[PDB]
Design a protein around this nucleic acid. Structure first.
Ligand SMILES: [Mg+2]
Ligand SMILES: [Mg+2]
Lengths: 538, 741, 685
RNA sequence: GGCCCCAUGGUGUAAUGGUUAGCACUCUGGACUUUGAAUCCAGCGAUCCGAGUUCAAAUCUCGGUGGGACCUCCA
């Protein structure tokens, strides 16, 4: 077949890319394919992945920057790896009888071999099913795909997905945690502690893990279990801020439990991401806008993250009968886009929005969403109405380089202060004032008088996150065009130390680090006192 | 003799998960040594039958290394390791465990061991030198100066670790040398001077963890294989004593896990000194590097590799005594071997090896005719073991020939329905039933030698035919149970099936009966309050029992049938409350004597109660059911009880009682027919540390050879063959002499 | 955070009326107030003390002459000159004015209880005495009539229905004591009588009801075991929070609740119960507010309960943002005006620590911004007082600009002062910077004196709860306050000198040692920090210089550069004084975003500004802050720089977010504190 | 060797001097911290090669390059 000539095409195309590089002249890529594709008799332009595939070692090293496919996987600062666990029943079906109304799929649903809330057809689902829910295989597959695309996986970030992660026995959970840490590091451990200790000295650094949970399985014991695992971020389903809704939907808990979980998690040192759920089947539009104004105004709900989710009706669920019988009529697309525009206008300047729309395919959804591009339509309507969206997901350096073209020219130190679920927090950042471009951030806090961890008692200020945005520069590398190794972290630590020892009036500064980042803090002057990095400031 | 003997016939197992657990001794008829669960297994590839086992460890075994004989004789000593923080030295002779020394003092599981016969001139009889690197951020140096052991030295690598070690001797002398790599992307050389190991030099090599080092003394020169993790092998040299860097040969694309020089060998008196190199990596390939004939630069020779499914590469590989074969240990647990084709050295052909589940085997079923066994375990796999004929030759071998299910759930139970039918209780709410294709029966005819027309009533495969080209088709699917299945058992008539599921209330702890022909629920029997742990049907096919976690049982007797086509009904004839119960804790086993009127029970209270008395079947008017004789106290939590399916002259009732630790014990019982209820039980034969497991025992199923109703052809009619479905990955089959009448 | 301040009170007494007041309303375009008595309508003008129109309903056989009959309510009607009135006998009359024409426009058999006119007057709602509700069009053409009636009742509930409209007039809510359950119940309808919702069963519901103007929460009150709280319903009918009044159990009654013109300030009316045999009762009008969902208490006013002080009705001004009208029983008229501000300390740069004092009723939440930049709901330290606080101010001495002076309702001027030894007095409690282990090195003030104000003779003060406003602590011993004389526009400036020489005894005496008289209403007073010269703004906005150090207490008009009088084109709320090179200027700002250096407008889009030691900082309405120097700049230089047409560059301009308001300035750190409408803080350079 | 016809994006054909090119397969980018291959929306890309006639030609004359067709010499 001419496809055999196709690899000659690559065999020619590579022969060009290095050749010009030998004499150091940049060569255009689209037109070189076009030219050395009509001479060998091709009927399809080459795909970049096959070009990246067959390259000699040093030539791969020198042509990765000019042959990077989808330059957003490393434009945020980490490498996302999504894994799931075994199908299991949610832990409020015993004393209630039925799981939440709107949940699609699950172990006892009509979708065969379906994880809870993740029916059968999201990409992570086919990634995990063929591995039969084996963490080793899944993480290796994701890493090898990310290396196929031509990215650097030197900094990894795990996300466990599925149902709830606490309704499982101890053996299965520790099996997951050790397998993940060993897969990233290369060891073969027996318990969690050995896995963590070898992961600490590993080369491919780990940054942390994110777990989803219900607020009723978020207590002191569970927080201890997380802090042993190395987790550094937690997500709680906070559907609706109204008590009537959270009882009429068989949610199984109350808002007060959610507020208490917020208090405990933020006092311990985590970062919490809420799952709000517009268009619940009793609420309405003005009620939505009021509940979101309350959620971003009440100093008992202010998170450091958000993940919106418009309602979708799916067969074999509680909402399906209500829709069929003549209740819970949906929203028209225009008013939905208007509403989403209003929320994104209300979003505060320190909350990062991750996801706006569900990944559910068109044939599955019976009603509720037409275009799987709601964020861009919402932003267009913002620029239509004159209002502005000013979160950090649309102001970090990486995003506003692929979008637009401008780059920071003058950097300044902005500081914000707040009142969280009962603690006093600060927010330091280096960013461009005149252009609204963010670079790096920090999150201090003064622990309240309801802490339950021994290390944080007696005059302790905690740091929950450090993150400098840009492009993923591997460890010990130095590049003068990216931003991740220019020296902002040292200045942020200096100012955080000054704040914690002069304004907070504290005695200990503690950092909830990951595992691969631990060595980093050892060059600052910190120590280890458990799952924390402490330092005497006096 | 008067006291019958117990012997273990067959063992099936495989290496565990860990890197470095493999070795061949350098000598004729060298013995392969690997590690399964918490034991070391010696097996000869040529015999294709396991040699023996060397128990004594407690945790998972990590690394095993032989100690070669300098002359070239088969090795004697065998240094081991484990995750129980102790290093065990072994001494073998005539395939029997001679000596075992428990060296201890490690605060952390060991990962690297290396030793060699030291050659001091002050008549140091069998003076060795053991080195062990563990998870204690330190390495220890030992010595077995005869029948005594003492720790020589301890070196701590700060908060780092140690990953590879080897000992050798400097040229023109006998000064010890030690190559110790670490996670510091670096290897160190320590030479023993004065009387303490010192620091000599610090090489700057790769940029990843070193997953192996190896010395090679050729002529008067030293060559150091320095395998790495960043796809880079690096050969060094050491000459009179500075070290120099040499060829940096590469060609792998993933982590490279092992490297081993081909060892010297004696061919017709003259020793041979080959210069080659074998390695394995995650990339699912093996590269055999040899230098060019004219130029000294190293080049690839062969690219032997495995293509099955989408599994990963290999953790270890071993070459041979001289050059004949090659073995590699896969990821999921597998052994791939290849011998060099005489016509083409670059050509290599597969062979036959052993296998087994890589997790605890939960259940086992013997074939009704008695020629294959089906085993199911937590490894989410079902394996069928059958014999083979090695042409006109003795020592018939049983080994894997099929793999009906590679299902993705955690299977827990098993049941036969017919000659080729299959029911598996997974970790879901559905019972899945299987049938057999014609390829299986055709291959079974081709292998076992039984005629095709006879098997249908008118070489064994390798890793490729089983993992990819073997799957028994599913025929139906049974719903109805609201929770995961926990106990499955059929009846001897292959008509009624019974199932039980995990439960926490009375409604969920109800057993369900199904018809074989029309697969619909015959009846639902409700009793107890927790999950029914064990169940089986009566040999005369009119009783039932449901000993469960609630420390009770059930006696669901059969009711008379008026209409022939009507499905039979069951009624509760006897029961037991907390007061009537004699067991102190959870019950986990049951079996009936094949006398239709007595049965056994086994709990976790270390007591075996033989309460039967289910006689006078025709005139069973009231309940006269209770304890039958004295309660035996073996001394451990009994997990499985079974009764041999044949009766014996002096009213003998022989039972194979297991325990928590593998302690398969044969007991013999008879009612005293008098108010003295002592000495009714007698003890026949125990099991030693060579015929027993190292972990739990799950099912001691016997062999009921219904094909041999009468002993047609026998070698004396004195043997009984039974199974031990253990938890330490072993499916060992035992043979026991019974009697002589 | 900011707090309210009283700056204008208008009191007109003894209106010549035949009977006694029963209801009243306003005519905002004319500024005249209508008062429906038990005899006939009366039209009054408070700024001139006259009664122009006086209709006699009794004469024209409408109001019975026996001495009874209730006017349901006087309602002014827009784009006209007539008034729509009602009578408890069950009639609605469209009585005109001037021409004295009185025509019967509606008659119903059963009597009428309450009249409710929507914020736009095209649909009116009436409630009958037969327990039915009539919806009428603007021209009194009938539209519809539907019945209201589709643990026990509170004892002093008078069974009087109240009706509330939304701000936009789309929905309304009816409060009725349900005969079945004998409990308060709320029903919500839309414009065309669609039954929107019914309230949830709640025990102990009060009688009050006031839908929020913008509209998300319906105010009400509930008496729970051991407390009395104000609860907020929503349109659906369910409770969505509450807040607790600071009073004992079963002691005070809540009369009614009413909202501001922009859903900002909520006024609650409280009356003391006569449970004790004597139980000398008290009247409370309390002005609260909302911050970070924590309800501050900013003002508390105390009348006399019985006698010639019976408070008959209150009305928030529907047009003017912060203006409250009070009608007493003895034909008495009161008008109160307020405006927002914040209290901050300015002093020598080497020693001054910038401070913020925020009122929360009986506490003061001080925050020192030089060391601990603290969010609003938290504070550095906290001062506690026995009875609610009204006015708070800082000392104006250049080297001592950290000594607070807190005034309270019962007229007890405390003097909290910072010293070497903290003295460990319990009145100063650590805020968010104290606790076990947590400790920051700072010095907290300690109480020094509890001066008691003395007034001339032993008169009964007045029915006015407040007699002093705009207290200024110009010197450690000498204070300043201003009062308005009722009859003449003559305003009086007092001198509350320290009669007590030193720390002789607690409960010292402050004596009025002087009283200067200057014609015209005074709306604001300020003083210089270095020269300590005092500037007054008369009602017109004219700027008069005042000399307290002068024995004659002479008041001279402020002279501009050319020695001419200075007059603001408009009344100026916030005023400060600056030292611009070699001239002193009366910097000022209006409610309509105007800057008024001397008398010349130099901007038209300013939201908030602040002047510190040669540093003028401004927040334009274009979301762009600015900062100008004053060390060597000139009036022309500032005019040209702030001309708004000179090109803006990066050295001065610095963008901010939407609605940022400057809080304070930190010079030595060169830092600025901004508060957004959400509530948080931001620091820039 | 004349003879008659043809050449358009990588590929398939559209379009008669206001000159100044649209559709399909294919490729690339964003929604996406659940995805190179799915959905939606945007985008990169052509009139082989010369002289010219007409103010002006993917459109007309002549060329010479490639392809197709009739009688071809030729070996
Ligand atoms: Mg074409
Ligand atoms: Mg793509």
């Amino acid at each position: 077949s001419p496809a055999e000539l196709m690899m000659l095409t690559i065999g020619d195309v590579i022969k060009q890319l290095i050749e010009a590089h030998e004499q150091g002249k940049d060569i255009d890529l689209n037109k070189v394919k076009t030219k050395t594709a009509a001479k060998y008799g091709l009927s399809a332009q080459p795909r970049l992945v096959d070009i990246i595939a067959a390259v000699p070692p040093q030539y791969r090293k020198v042509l990765m920057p000019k042959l990077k496919a989808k330059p957003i996987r490393t434009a945020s600062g980490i490498a996302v790896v999504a894994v799931m666990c075994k199908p299991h029943r949610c832990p409020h079906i015993s004393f209630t009888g039925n799981i939440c109304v709107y949940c699609p799929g699950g172990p006892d649903s009509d979708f065969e071999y379906s994880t809870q809330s993740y029916t059968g057809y999201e990409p992570t689902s086919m990634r995990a099913i063929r591995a039969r829910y084996d963490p080793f295989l899944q993480t290796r597959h994701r890493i090898e795909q990310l290396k196929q695309l031509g990215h650097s996986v030197d900094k990894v970030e795990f996300i466990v997905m599925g149902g709830t992660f606490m309704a499982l026995p101890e053996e299965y959970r520790d099996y997951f945690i050790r397998n993940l840490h060993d897969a990233l590091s290369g060891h073969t451990s027996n318990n969690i502690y050995e896995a963590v200790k070898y992961s600490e000295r590993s080369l491919t650094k780990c940054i942390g893990i994110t777990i989803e949970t219900r607020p009723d399985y978020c207590m002191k014991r569970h927080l201890s279990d997380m802090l042993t695992y190395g987790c550094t971020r937690l997500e709680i389903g906070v559907q609706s801020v109204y008590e009537d809704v959270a009882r009429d939907t068989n949610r199984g808990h109350t808002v007060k439990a959610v507020c208490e979980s917020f208090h405990l998690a933020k006092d311990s040192g985590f970062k919490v991401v809420a799952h709000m759920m517009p268009d619940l089947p009793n609420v309405g539009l003005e009620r939505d806008i009021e509940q979101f104004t309350e959620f971003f105004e009440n100093p008992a709900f202010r998170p450091d993250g958000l993940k919106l989710y418009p309602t979708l009706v799916i067969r074999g669920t509680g909402l399906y009968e209500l829709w069929k019988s003549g209740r819970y009529k949906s929203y028209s697309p225009s008013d939905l886009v208007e509403l989403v525009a209003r929320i994104l206008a209300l979003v505060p300047p320190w909350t990062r929005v991750y996801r706006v729309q569900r990944d559910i395919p068109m044939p599955l959804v019976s009603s509720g969403v037409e275009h799987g591009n709601l964020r861009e339509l919402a932003l267009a309507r913002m620029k239509d109405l004159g209002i502005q969206c000013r979160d950090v997901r649309t102001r970090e350096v990486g995003i506003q380089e692929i979008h637009h073209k401008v780059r920071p020219y003058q950097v300044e130190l902005v500081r914000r202060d707040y009142v969280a679920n009962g603690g006093w927090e600060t927010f330091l950042s280096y960013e461009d004032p005149d252009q609204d471009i963010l670079i790096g951030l920090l999150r201090l806090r003064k622990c309240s008088e309801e802490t339950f961890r021994f290390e944080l008692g007696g005059g302790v200020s905690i740091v929950r996150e450090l993150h400098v945005y840009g492009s993923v520069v591997p460890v010990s590398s130095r590049d003068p065009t990216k931003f991740q190794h220019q020296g902002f972290g040292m200045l942020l630590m200096e100012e955080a130390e000054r704040i914690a020892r002069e304004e907070h009036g504290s005695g200990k500064i503690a950092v909830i680090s990951g595992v691969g980042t631990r060595n980093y803090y050892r060059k600052i002057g910190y120590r280890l006192q458990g799952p924390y990095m402490v330092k005497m400031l006096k | 003799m008067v006291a019958p003997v117990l012997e273990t016939s067959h063992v099936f197992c495989c290496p565990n998960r860990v890197r470095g657990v493999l070795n061949w001794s350098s000598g004729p008829r060298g013995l392969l040594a690997f590690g399964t669960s918490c034991s070391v297994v010696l097996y000869d590839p040529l015999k294709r039958v396991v040699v023996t086992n060397l128990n004594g460890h407690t945790a998972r075994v990590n690394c095993i290394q032989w100690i070669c004989k300098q002359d070239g004789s088969p090795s004697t000593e065998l240094v081991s390791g484990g995750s129980d923080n102790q290093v065990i030295h072994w001494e073998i002779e005539d395939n029997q465990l001679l000596k075992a020394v428990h060296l201890q003092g490690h605060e952390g599981p060991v990962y690297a061991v290396h030793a060699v016969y030291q050659r001091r001139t002050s008549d140091p009889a069998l003076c060795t030198l053991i080195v062990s690197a563990a998870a204690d951020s330190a390495v220890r140096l030992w010595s077995k100066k005869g029948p005594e052991v003492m720790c020589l030295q301890t070196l701590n690598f700060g908060n780092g670790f140690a990953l590879a070690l080897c000992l050798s001797f400097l040229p023109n002398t006998d000064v010890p040398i030690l190559a110790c790599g670490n996670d510091d992307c670096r290897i160190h050389i320590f030479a023993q001077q004065n009387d303490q190991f010192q620091k000599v030099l610090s090489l700057c090599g790769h940029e990843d963890w070193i997953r192996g080092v190896e010395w090679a003394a050729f002529g008067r020169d030293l060559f150091l294989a320095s395998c790495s993790q960043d796809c880079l092998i690096r050969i060094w040299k050491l000459y009179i004593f500075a070290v120099t860097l040499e060829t940096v040969l590469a060609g792998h694309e993933n982590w490279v896990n092992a490297v081993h020089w081909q060892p010297v060998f004696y061919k017709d008196g003259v020793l041979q000194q080959p210069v080659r190199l074998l390695s394995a990596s995650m990339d699912k390939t093996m590269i055999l590097w040899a230098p060019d004939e004219e130029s000294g630069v190293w080049l690839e020779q062969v690219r032997v590799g495995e293509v099955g499914g989408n599994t990963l590469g290999f953790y270890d590989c071993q070459f041979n005594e001289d050059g004949s074969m090659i073995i590699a240990h896969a990821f999921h647990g597998a052994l791939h071997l290849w011998k060099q084709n005489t016509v083409n050295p670059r050509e290599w052909t597969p062979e036959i090896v052993i296998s087994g589940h890589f997790d605890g085997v939960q259940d086992l079923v013997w074939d009704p005719e008695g020629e294959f066994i089906i085993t199911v375990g937590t490894d989410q796999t079902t394996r069928l073991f059958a014999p083979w004929k090695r042409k006109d030759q003795s020592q018939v071998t049983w080994h894997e020939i099929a793999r009906p299910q590679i299902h993705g759930y955690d299977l827990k139970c098993l049941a036969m329905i017919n000659r080729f039918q299959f029911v598996s209780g997974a970790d879901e709410k559905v019972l899945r039933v299987f049938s057999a294709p014609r390829n299986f029966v055709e291959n079974f005819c081709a292998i076992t030698g039984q005629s095709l027309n006879h098997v249908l009533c008118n070489e064994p495969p390798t890793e490729d035919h089983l993992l990819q080209n073997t799957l028994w088709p599913e025929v139906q699917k049974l719903y109805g149970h609201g929770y995961e299945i926990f106990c499955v058992t059929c009846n001897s008539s292959k008509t009624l099936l019974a199932s039980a599921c995990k439960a926490a209330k009375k409604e969920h702890a109800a057993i369900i009966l199904w018809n074989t022909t029309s697969w619909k629920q015959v009846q639902n029997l409700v009793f107890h309050s927790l999950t029914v742990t064990q169940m089986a049907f009566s040999p005369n096919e009119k009783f039932l029992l449901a000993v469960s976690r609630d420390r009770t049982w059930s006696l669901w007797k059969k009711q008379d049938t008026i209409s022939p086509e009507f499905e039979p009904v069951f009624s509760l004839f006897a029961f037991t409350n907390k007061i009537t119960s004699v067991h102190s804790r959870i019950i986990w086993s049951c079996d009936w004597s094949p006398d239709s009127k007595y049965f056994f029970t086994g709990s976790r209270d270390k007591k075996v109660v033989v309460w039967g008395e289910c006689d006078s079947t025709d005139d069973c008017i009231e309940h006269n059911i209770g304890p039958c004789s004295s309660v035996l106290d073996v001394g451990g939590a009994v997990t499985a009880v079974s009764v041999c399916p044949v009766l014996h002259p002096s009213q003998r009732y022989v039972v194979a009682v297991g325990l928590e630790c593998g302690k398969i014990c044969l007991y013999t019982w008879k009612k005293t027919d008098q108010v003295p209820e002592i000495n009714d039980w007698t003890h026949c034969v125990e099991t030693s540390q060579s015929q027993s497991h190292t972990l739990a025992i799950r099912k001691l199923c016997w062999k009921n050879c219904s094909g041999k109703t009468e002993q047609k052809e026998a070698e004396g009619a004195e043997w009984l063959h039974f199974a031990s479905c253990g938890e330490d990955h072993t499916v060992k089959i035992h043979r026991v002499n019974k009697c002589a009448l | 955070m900011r707090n309210l301040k009283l700056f204008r009170t208008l009191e007109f007494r003894d209106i010549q009326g035949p009977g006694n007041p029963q209801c009243f309303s306003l005519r905002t375009e004319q500024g005249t107030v209508l008062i429906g008595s038990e005899h006939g309508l009366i039209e009054v003008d408070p700024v001139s003390r006259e009664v122009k129109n006086e209709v006699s309903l009794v004469a024209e056989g409408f109001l019975p002459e026996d001495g009874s009959g209730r006017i349901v309510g006087v309602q002014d009607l827009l784009d006209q000159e007539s008034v729509c009135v009602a009578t408890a006998s069950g009639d609605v009359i469209l009585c005109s004015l001037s021409t004295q024409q009185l025509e019967c426009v509606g008659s119903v058999a059963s009597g009428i209880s309450v009249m409710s006119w929507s914020p736009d007057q095209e649909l009116v709602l009436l409630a009958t005495g037969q327990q039915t509700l009539i919806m009428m069009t603007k021209d009194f053409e009938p539209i519809l009539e539907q019945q209201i009636h589709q643990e026990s009742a509170l004892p002093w509930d008078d069974h009087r229905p109240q009706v509330t409209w939304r701000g936009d007039g789309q929905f309304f809510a009816v409060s009725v004591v349900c005969p079945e359950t004998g409990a308060r119940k709320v029903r919500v309808w839309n414009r065309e009588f669609a039954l929107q919702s019914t309230s949830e069963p709640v025990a102990g519901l009060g009688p009050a009801l006031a839908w929020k103007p913008s509209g998300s929460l319906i105010a009400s009150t509930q008496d729970k075991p051991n407390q009395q709280d104000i609860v907020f319903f929503e349109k659906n009918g369910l409770l969505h929070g509450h807040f607790t009044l600071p009073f004992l159990k079963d002691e005070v009654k809540v009369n009614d609740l009413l909202w501001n013109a922009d859903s900002s300030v909520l006024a609650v009316w409280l009356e003391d119960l006569q449970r004790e045999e004597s139980s000398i009762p008290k009247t409370c009008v309390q002005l609260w507010t909302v911050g970070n969902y924590h309800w501050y208490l900013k003002q508390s006013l105390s009348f006399s309960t019985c006698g010639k002080s019976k408070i008959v009705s209150l009305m928030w001004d529907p047009v003017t943002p912060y203006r409250l009208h009070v009608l007493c029983q003895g034909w008495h008229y009161l008008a109160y005006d307020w405006h927002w501000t914040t209290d901050r300390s300015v002093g020598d740069n080497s020693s001054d620590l910038s401070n913020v004092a925020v009122i929360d009723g009986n506490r003061v939440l001080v925050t020192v911004f030089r060391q601990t930049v603290v969010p609003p709901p938290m504070c550095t330290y906290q001062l506690l007082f026995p009875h609610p606080v009204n006015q708070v101010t800082f000392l104006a001495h250049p080297q001592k600009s950290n000594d607070l002076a807190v005034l309270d309702a019962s007229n007890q001027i405390s003097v909290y002062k910072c010293g070497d030894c903290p003295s460990a007095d319990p009145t100063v409690k650590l805020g968010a910077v104290g606790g076990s282990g947590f400790k920051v090195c700072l010095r907290t003030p300690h109480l020094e004196k509890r001066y008691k104000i003395q007034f001339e003779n032993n008169e009964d003060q007045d029915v006015n709860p407040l007699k002093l406003g705009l207290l200024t602590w110009i010197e450690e011993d000498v204070f300043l306050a201003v009062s308005h004389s009722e009859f003449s526009p003559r305003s009086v400036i007092h001198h509350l000198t320290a009669a007590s020489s030193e720390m002789d005894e607690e409960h010292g005496q402050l004596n009025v040692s002087s009283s200067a008289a200057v014609d015209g209403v005074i709306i604001s007073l300020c003083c210089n920090s270095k020269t300590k010269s005092v500037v007054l703004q008369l009602a017109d906005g004219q700027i008069f210089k005042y000399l307290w150090e002068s024995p004659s207490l002479a008041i001279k008009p402020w002279k501009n550069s050319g020695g001419f009088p200075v007059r603001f084109p408009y009344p100026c709320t916030q005023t400060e004084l600056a030292m611009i090179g070699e001239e002193e200027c009366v910097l000022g700002l209006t409610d309509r975003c105007r800057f008024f250096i001397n008398d010349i407008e130099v901007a038209s889009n300013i939201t908030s500004f602040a002047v510190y030691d040669e540093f003028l900082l401004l927040t334009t309405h274009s979301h762009t802050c600015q900062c100008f120097c004053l060390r060597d700049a000139s009036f022309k230089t500032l005019q040209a720089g702030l001309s708004s047409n000179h090109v803006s560059h990066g050295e001065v301009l610095r963008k901010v977010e939407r609605g940022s308001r400057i809080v304070t300035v930190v010079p030595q750190d060169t830092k600025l504190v901004l508060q957004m409408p959400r509530g948080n803080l931001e620091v820039v350079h």
